[PDB]
Design a protein around this ligand. Structure first.
Ligand code: SF4
Ligand code: SF4
Ligand code: FCO
Ligand code: F3S
Ligand SMILES: [Mg+2]
Ligand code: NI
Lengths: 544, 262
């Protein structure tokens, strides 16, 4: 069964490594199981305060720096936000190019997350040295497609590289790893660790290609520079040779997704089936992404190919429509001044006020986003459930392929294992659509190269820009006054997922998912990391 | 066999775009770099250890017998004794100060660590500062938001094999920052001829005319973007968008509004 100690007391993990930003997690453990938790964000920058009084056209360039991991997504949200405020509808080619760059971001972001941020919570790299390459090559034939990088020869070279590294005594990024000398919560046999490790190194090279594909349309990665009010500036991105290169690179990345990422994910989930009953939550929100009509926020919600919606109490039989007026942020348990609770983003208030470390009344720089008083999980799992419930064909096939492979019910997905599987699921679906989306833009741009519409700056107005970034529902809200930024508020996926308690003391998704976490070894609490990393935390995003 | 020089990489007030930029290197790739060339001994984004185990890894690295080089990403929030930016319960200013003290060299990756960056922009609510200003020490600056991996890895390799490179008035290596973006721009003939796009939808824009009227800061920005490109495929102006001047100090306040020359 699931290794669990008898430990009773507190555990603090700071810093949480292998995420973006600065997170501090506190838990109370009783008999080897978490009974209470706190998600404490440790850095404030204040982009919302900085944008006040500035040119609305500049907003996208400031907000993109909210995060360099989910690069682009904020530039996109700000562009959509300001496009809505000036009431301009972007040309079809601009919609297509914007959505493709988002698709490329999904591929890059999820590949890096699984291998470079999450995998070391499930894979014991040092145990890879115990593996027999020939036995690993044979096992690789029984869990994944045939490929030269999985040969005994290739796996031996990886092992030999790793052995020389470890024998140097300079363990670098592996220094003091929780898996050193063995750990009861790590289940994988040495043969699987070796396979996973070879792919870890391959992903380091593959992510460089995924970034190149994105830069063809985006100008550069990190931090794209091709979006403008009314559309895009990259005319070259509509031409033949650049889009042929974009397809070739994308096809390489997708081959890696199907040959390595999904198979590695499935193997790992197969060994850790017990994690299908740990770390689940109940409410899911998604604004949707990849819309066929982005002429307004309403059209975005309704035409997103990855559907938008709201699920409550795990009821996959009732997907409600998103009510953008029902969103608000609380600050009761956050480091902000009193009187800022229950604010809708259009009326958002960012007034920083610090108290002290581990103050149970004020313990995070993140605000607490709530929907009609309920905490909402956002991200790949939310999107997957919403799409599955609505019978989205691509999601039904893939979710069912995963359930059929793991021999588990769909309810097993309400968990840390499901959350991890969901991220892989949508990566596979984006991959399946790349060739279709690229062809649509190629044909359109060849026919007519309009890429940016005409518009006018209003004296006064407001707007909202919606997006479903790799981590979930993203929204930028602007109030324009005197042709300037009067108020600008960001409500980011990691704010929904990892923020603190709301005005009712109600736990956030991550705090709630941490309850019931078994702790095999209090000194090396990998289980806490597994669940937290499953949400793919981005703290600079969360706080901005 | 051969001892690899120890590198400590700290994250302060940053977006992690600089870390992301670094792993985009292809000469060499990041794995070859950390397996063969250096010993990356602390890096929160990718290191296996967490919490106290990670803090111990840092302190083991700072006490290493063979010394270490320091890379700093992000600015330093100084308001309220530095408490708006913490790691392991310590103010970022305090941890960087401690690590800078015995460093063989200090490299600031990104405009944030070099000059203060985005959080420093008016009204600067966290009273953020660049490393050199906050610590009172000279630093090797590799600015840009984020800088090109060719520039960062180039500087690291240079520092470990040839010593400190020649630096400009702003601490930037002349090897990479000795030319204006504008001087190597393929649209320079349009500029000379006064052929400016008046808007992004215009035929002038479709014809690839100079973007100066649209705010391009290339003429006052030192970087190698048009020469080396990003991701081996593109750069902003090639993508039809003006340069924001992201490698210049306080560009957030000196280069805005981005779409104007005023
Ligand atoms: S310099 Fe730019 S890319 Fe690098 S950390 Fe700062 S904001 Fe992020
Ligand atoms: S686009 Fe910018 S860098 Fe290129 S020539 Fe015109 S002003 Fe100079
Ligand atoms: N994905 C992503 Fe970043 C977060 N959280 C944003 O938006
Ligand atoms: S915006 Fe920055 S990346 Fe180069 S093109 Fe201008 S210096
Ligand atoms: Mg906000
Ligand atoms: Ni992010």
């Amino acid at each position: 069964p699931t290794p669990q100690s008898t430990f009773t007391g507190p555990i603090v993990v700071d810093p949480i490594t292998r995420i973006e930003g600065h997170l501090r997690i506190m838990v109370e453990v009783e008999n080897g199981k978490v009974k209470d938790a706190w998600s404490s964000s440790q850095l404030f920058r204040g982009l919302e305060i900085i944008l006040k009084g500035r040119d609305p056209r500049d907003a996208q360039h400031f907000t993109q720096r909210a995060c360099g991991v989910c690069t682009y997504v904020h530039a996109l949200a700000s562009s959509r936000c300001v496009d809505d405020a000036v009431k301009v509808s972007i040309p079809a080619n601009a919609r297509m190019m914007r959505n493709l760059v988002m698709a490329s971001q999904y591929l890059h972001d999820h590949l890096v997350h699984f291998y470079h941020l999450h995998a070391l919570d499930w894979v014991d790299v040092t145990a890879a040295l115990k593996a027999d390459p020939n036995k690993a090559a044979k096992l690789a034939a029984s869990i994944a497609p045939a490929r030269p990088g999985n040969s005994a020869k290739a796996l031996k070279a990886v092992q030999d590289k790793l052995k020389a590294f470890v024998e140097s005594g300079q363990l670098g990024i592996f220094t003091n790893a929780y898996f050193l000398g063995g750990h009861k919560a790590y289940y994988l046999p040495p043969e699987v660790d070796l396979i996973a490790t070879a792919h870890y190194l391959e992903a380091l090279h593959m992510q460089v290609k995924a970034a190149s594909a994105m830069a063809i349309l985006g100008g550069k990665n990190p931090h794209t520079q091709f979006t403008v009010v009314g559309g895009c500036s990259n005319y070259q991105g509509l031409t033949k040779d650049p889009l042929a290169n974009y397809l070739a690179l994308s096809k390489e990345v997708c081959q890696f997704v199907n040959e390595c990422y999904i198979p590695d994910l499935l193997a790992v989930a197969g060994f850790y089936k017990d994690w299908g009953g740990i770390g689940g939550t109940s409410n899911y929100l998604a604004f949707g992404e990849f819309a066929t009509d982005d002429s307004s926020p309403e059209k975005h919600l309704a035409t997103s190919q990855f559907p938008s919606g709201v699920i409550t109490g795990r009821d996959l039989g009732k997907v409600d429509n998103v009510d953008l007026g029902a969103i608000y942020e609380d600050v009761k348990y956050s480091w902000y001044a009193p009187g800022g609770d229950g604010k809708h983003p259009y009326d958002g208030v960012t007034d920083p006020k610090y108290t002290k470390l581990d103050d149970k009344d004020h313990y995070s720089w993140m605000k607490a986003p709530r929907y009609k008083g309920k905490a909402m999980e956002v991200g790949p799992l939310a999107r997957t459930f919403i799409a599955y419930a609505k019978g989205q064909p691509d999601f039904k096939k893939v979710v069912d392929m995963v359930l059929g492979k793991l021999s588990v019910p769909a309810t097993a997905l309400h968990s840390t294992l499901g959350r991890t599987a969901a991220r892989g699921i949508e990566t596979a679906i984006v991959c399946a659509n790349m060739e279709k989306w690229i062809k649509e833009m190629a044909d359109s741009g060849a026919k007519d190269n309009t890429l940016c519409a005409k518009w006018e700056m209003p004296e006064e107005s407001k707007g909202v820009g919606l997006a479903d970034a790799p981590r979930g529902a993203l929204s930028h809200w602007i109030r324009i006054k005197g042709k300037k930024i009067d108020n600008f508020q960001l409500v980011v996926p990691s704010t929904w997922n990892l923020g603190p308690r709301g005005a009712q003391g109600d736990k956030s998704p991550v705090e709630e998912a941490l309850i019931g976490t078994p702790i095999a070894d209090p000194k090396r609490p990998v289980e806490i990391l597994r669940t937290v990393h499953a949400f793919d935390p981005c703290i600079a995003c969360g706080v901005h | 066999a051969k001892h690899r020089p120890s590198v400590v990489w700290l994250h302060n007030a940053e977006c992690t775009g600089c870390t992301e930029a670094a792993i985009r290197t292809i000469k060499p790739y990041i794995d070859a770099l950390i397996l063969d060339t250096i010993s990356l001994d602390y890096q929160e984004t990718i290191m296996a250890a967490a919490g106290e185990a990670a803090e111990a890894a840092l302190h083991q690295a700072l006490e290493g017998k063979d010394g270490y080089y320091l890379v700093v990403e992000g600015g330093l929030p100084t308001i309220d004794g530095g408490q708006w930016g913490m790691v392991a319960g310590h103010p970022m200013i305090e941890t960087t100060k401690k690590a800078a003290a015995k460093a063989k060299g200090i490299i600031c990756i990104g405009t944030c660590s070099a000059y203060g960056g985005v959080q420093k922009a008016k009204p600067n609510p966290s009273q953020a500062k660049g490393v050199s200003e906050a610590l009172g020490v000279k630093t090797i600056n590799i600015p840009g938001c984020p800088p090109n991996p060719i520039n960062f890895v180039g500087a690291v390799v240079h520092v470990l094999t040839k010593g400190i490179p020649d630096l400009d008035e702003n601490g930037r290596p002349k090897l990479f920052y000795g030319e204006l973006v504008h001087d190597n721009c393929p649209r320079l003939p349009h500029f000379e001829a006064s052929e400016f796009a008046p808007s992004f939808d215009s035929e002038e824009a479709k014809k690839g005319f100079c973007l100066y009227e649209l705010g391009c800061k290339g003429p006052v920005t030192y970087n190698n973007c048009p020469k080396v490109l990003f991701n081996q495929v593109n750069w902003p102006v090639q993508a039809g968008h003006p340069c924001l001047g992201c490698s210049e100090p306080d560009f957030w306040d000196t280069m805005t509004p981005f779409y104007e020359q005023g």
